[PDB]
Design a protein around this ligand. Structure first.
Ligand SMILES: [Cu+]
Length: 129
């Protein structure tokens, strides 16, 4: 609703939403992430990272090497448009980004960069109204 969306992540390594459509009327957009499971962030942590589809694996790979304290996102990665912190069960986080950083027709992927999660936790985000 409005210029925001909510994605729930669980203990089975899955997002409940696979596609997010950003309305052209939005100048800013907010992504809310909820970890609805009961596992600790050291075993089943989740975040939400947004990049062009092409940059997915590269960003997830470098992110793994950043560590948990860095929310598994390489500090100052220019390929990441927006990202939340890594959360454990019973928690949540939000991230707001500039819609101008998004282009029509372009393909964007949101995924979890916690080690090994990217291969199963991913969705598509795009501008469209
Ligand atoms: Cu995850």
């Amino acid at each position: 609703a409005q210029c925001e969306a909510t994605v729930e992540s669980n203990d089975a390594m899955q997002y409940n939403v696979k596609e997010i459509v950003v309305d052209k009327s939005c100048k800013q957009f907010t992504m809310h992430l909820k970890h609805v499971g009961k596992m600790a962030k050291v075993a089943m942590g989740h975040n939400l990272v947004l990049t062009k589809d092409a940059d997915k694996q590269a960003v997830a790979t470098d992110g793994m090497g950043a560590g948990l304290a860095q929310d598994y996102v390489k500090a100052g990665d220019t390929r990441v448009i927006a990202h939340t912190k890594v959360i454990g069960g019973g928690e949540s986080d939000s991230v707001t980004f500039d819609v101008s950083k998004i282009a029509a027709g372009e393909n964007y992927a949101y995924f979890c960069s916690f080690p090994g999660h990217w291969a199963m936790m991913k969705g598509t985000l795009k501008l469209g109204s």
